[PDB]
């Protein structure tokens, strides 16, 4: 797959970034 | 496969068309305003600027050259833009730190031809044309 | 583009059918999309039947058959030459091959 894994990678990066943002504030 | 046809449906038709216009790119950028706010001109045809320096940009393959551009900073906005110089050997008329009047290229927002990411071109260097500076009809004021 | 009118499957007028495992691949295919085969064969082989019928204890003995029902995934059914790919219009024959 490449749509599936693109979606998965974007999801995991979004989780990391959301955690960083909301832990900063 | 279905579009209301009845005799009192005018509200639905009008309110639905008014919505669907917003998916048409060319209409959308006329009316959101975020294009005009982002335009490096003022929403004008031309702008004056001061020549920061001279660069060459390598053209996009297959064809090959170095395309002889100024990099200008505009007077009114103060924002920085790159511009092409339009004929054989003109890059010698452009001294550094004089004014220039840049114009559009020809496709209203987009880089023309083989040059990567240059959207404007020079017409006047110091209140004299390039077409006259190059055809010999005038010489630089200094 | 679409390749089969029935999608290569029997299901019409139904939502779901319970799966079934292949017999060599152990894959997991719908019971109507799998490739079935009934096999009825002698418990002895045809070479041996004249030797075994010679040392029976009894005078009349008709040896037993082996009834087995097989299901194949498509990859395994094509790898074992059970079915073959066919011409484009020759794909719409439903009658089984002549014996």
């Amino acid at each position: 797959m490449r749509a599936k894994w693109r979606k998965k990678r974007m999801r995991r990066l979004k989780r990391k970034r959301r955690k960083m943002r909301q832990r900063s504030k | 496969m279905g579009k209301c046809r009845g005799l009192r449906t005018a509200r639905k038709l009008r309110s639905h068309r008014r919505d669907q216009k917003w998916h048409d790119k060319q209409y959308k950028k006329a009316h959101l305003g975020t294009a005009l706010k982002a335009n490096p001109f003022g929403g004008a045809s031309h702008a004056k600027g001061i020549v920061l320096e001279k660069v060459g940009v390598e053209a996009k393959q297959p064809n090959s050259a170095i395309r002889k551009c100024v990099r200008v900073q505009l007077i009114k906005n103060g924002k920085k833009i790159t511009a092409f110089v339009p004929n054989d050997g003109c890059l010698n008329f452009i001294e550094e730190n004089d004014e220039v009047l840049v114009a559009g290229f020809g496709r209203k927002g987009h880089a023309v031809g083989d040059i990567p990411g240059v959207r404007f071109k020079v017409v006047k260097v110091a209140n004299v044309s390039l077409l006259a500076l190059y055809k010999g009809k005038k010489e630089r004021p200094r | 583009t679409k390749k089969r009118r029935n999608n290569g499957r029997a299901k019409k007028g139904r939502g779901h059918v319970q799966p079934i495992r292949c017999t060599n691949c152990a894959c997991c295919v719908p019971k109507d999309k799998a490739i079935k085969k009934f096999v009825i064969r002698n418990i002895v082989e045809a070479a041996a039947v004249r030797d075994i019928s010679e040392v029976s204890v009894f005078d009349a003995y008709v040896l037993p058959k082996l009834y087995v029902k097989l299901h194949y995934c498509v990859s395994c059914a094509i790898h074992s030459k059970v079915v073959r790919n066919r011409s484009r219009e020759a794909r719409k024959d439903r009658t089984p091959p002549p014996r």
Partner: protein, 108 residues
């Protein structure tokens, strides 16, 4: 090397290769490290870096592999950029170093 491609005209480089010296706005350099997109870093024989570009005449024709003597043309108005005009054989590189052409600075 070694492909199907006998389609391009054969090398024939055996005829009469000369020697080539500097000019106004030309100078020799050595290759430090190569980069993508075709362009490569360089290092001239006075100190400038001149992140250099392979001219259109040399595309997939003479292979500028790492760490060898090159000739670059400067630009009349920009200095941090240059373009490869020519690559030397190690024969020409020793010939220029002995002739008193390239400095006794860099090695081959």
């Amino acid at each position: 090397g070694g492909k199907n491609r006998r389609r391009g005209k054969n090398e024939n480089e055996s005829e009469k290769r000369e020697l080539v010296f500097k000019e106004d706005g030309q100078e020799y350099a050595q290759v430090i490290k190569m980069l993508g997109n075709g362009r490569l870093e360089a290092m001239c024989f006075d100190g400038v870096k001149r992140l250099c570009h392979i001219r259109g005449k040399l595309r997939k024709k003479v292979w500028i592999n790492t760490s060898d003597i090159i000739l670059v043309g400067l630009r009349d108005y920009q200095d941090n950029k240059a373009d490869v005009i020519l690559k030397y054989n190690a024969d020409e590189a020793r010939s220029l170093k002995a002739y008193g052409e390239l400095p006794e600075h860099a090695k081959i």
